[PDB]
């Protein structure tokens, strides 16, 4: 039901601010898979500091065993977006309504993602 | 541990050296910062995004690094990231013992076969600094 | 002194700040801006209540 799932550790922030009132691009390096991630997370609403560990999962739907297009109690940063570019160590480009996401990992790790599909973004800070 | 000079990653463009010195002395111990220089792309009206600060003791440098690693340094809604520098602002050894002031310095050569040393010129109140990293 | 109105008071016996007459803040971002400038971003959090008037 879940295509990708791994534990990420943030490395640096682009704005490096506390009250900038702007979207902050995060750079989290994956563990045991060697994957680099870019994501725009609003720090004012969802706080994230350098050195914290969080999990990340992507699923085509939130329902159990089908019904594309109950994981709300587990995760706390559910989003919805679309993957519009797969061709680049493959990389992904998913826009969550203007919030760009870059998932550059391994070619074998990213192989079950079709072009122009709707996918979710489940995240939890442990 | 070789040098005490630390390079700050990002600082606001509107700050002055005095403000950063006061912030560091407030977070750290009193008068624990020796030198602080902000590079400028112009003569005196355009500072850069980074700065270099030299501390007095290595323990202060370690404490500052620990504070920066925990993101406990917030100066004007900016997180100060600390990293090692290439060279010190002033070639000054980080040791309270290797700094000698007000000592007598004289030059000369042995006179004869006996354990005798003739003094050519004598200087008083000279400063001697022993640098191990620079080997001078 | 940053608050335009008399919303926060200084308690002498405990040497700390208190809240007196809370319905005089006028929703002016003055104490929050001062706290952010002094280095405390999440010191005072003021939010309007939706079901009270």
UniProtKB/Swiss-Prot annotation, chain A:
Protein name per Swiss-Prot or TrEMBL: DNA-directed RNA polymerases II, IV and V subunit 8B
Localization of this protein: Nucleus
Organism name: Arabidopsis thaliana
Family: Belongs to the eukaryotic RPB8 RNA polymerase subunit family.
InterPro entries in alphabetical order: NA-bd_OB-fold (IPR012340), RPABC3 (IPR005570)
Its biological purpose: DNA-dependent RNA polymerase catalyzes the transcription of DNA into RNA using the four ribonucleoside triphosphates as substrates. Component of RNA polymerase II which synthesizes mRNA precursors and many functional non-coding RNAs. Pol II is the central component of the basal RNA polymerase II transcription machinery. It is composed of mobile elements that move relative to each other.
Subunit structure: Component of the RNA polymerase II, IV and V complexes. Associates with the mediator complex.
GO molecular function: DNA-directed RNA polymerase activity
Pfam families linked: RNA_pol_Rpb8
One GO process term, biological-process aspect: DNA-templated transcription
Keyword Phosphoprotein in annotation: no
Taxonomic lineage: Eukaryota, Viridiplantae, Streptophyta, Embryophyta, Tracheophyta
Keywords: Nucleus
Gene Ontology CC: one annotated term: RNA polymerase IV complex
From Swiss-Prot, chain B:
Disruption phenotype: Late flowering and absence of siRNAs derived from FWA tandem repeat regions. Loss of de novo methylation. Increased expression of retrotransposon-derived solo long terminal repeat (solo LTR) and SDC due to their derepression; levels are even higher in the double mutant rdr2-1 jmj24-1.
Cell compartment(s), UniProt: Nucleus, Nucleoplasm; Nucleus, Nucleolus; Nucleus
Signal peptide residue numbers: none
Family affiliation: Belongs to the RdRP family.
Additional free-text comment from the UniProt record: RDR2 is non-functional in the absence of associated Pol IV.
UniProt subunit comment: Interacts with NRPD1 and SHH1. Associates with Pol IV complex, forming an interpolymerase channel bridging their active sites, through which the Pol IV-generated transcript is handed over to the RDR2 active site after being backtracked, where it is used as the template for double-stranded RNA (dsRNA) synthesis. Interacts with JMJ24.
Job description of the protein: RNA-dependent direct polymerase involved in the production of small interfering RNAs (siRNAs). Binds to single-stranded RNA (ssRNA); engages ssRNAs longer than 7 nucleotides and initiates internal to their 3' ends. Able to transcribe the RNA of an RNA/DNA hybrid, the transcript produced by Pol IV, if its 3' end is accessible, to generate double-stranded small interfering RNAs (dsRNAs) precursor essential for establishing and maintaining DNA methylation.
Protein name: RNA-dependent RNA polymerase 2
Source organism phylogeny: Eukaryota, Viridiplantae, Streptophyta, Embryophyta, Tracheophyta
Gene that encodes it: RDR2
Swiss-Prot record, chain C:
Organism of this sequence: Arabidopsis thaliana (Mouse-ear cress)
Function as written in the Swiss-Prot or TrEMBL entry: DNA-dependent RNA polymerase catalyzes the transcription of DNA into RNA using the four ribonucleoside triphosphates as substrates. Component of RNA polymerase II which synthesizes mRNA precursors and many functional non-coding RNAs. Pol II is the central component of the basal RNA polymerase II transcription machinery. It is composed of mobile elements that move relative to each other. NRPB3 is part of the core element with the central large cleft and the clamp element that moves to open and close the cleft.
Superkingdom assignment: Eukaryota
Name of the protein in question: DNA-directed RNA polymerases II, IV and V subunit 3
Localization per Swiss-Prot or TrEMBL: Nucleus
Family under the similarity heading: Belongs to the archaeal Rpo3/eukaryotic RPB3 RNA polymerase subunit family.
Subunit structure: Component of the RNA polymerase II complex consisting of at least 12 subunits. Interacts with SHH1, CLSY1, NRPB11 and NRPD1. Interacts with IYO.
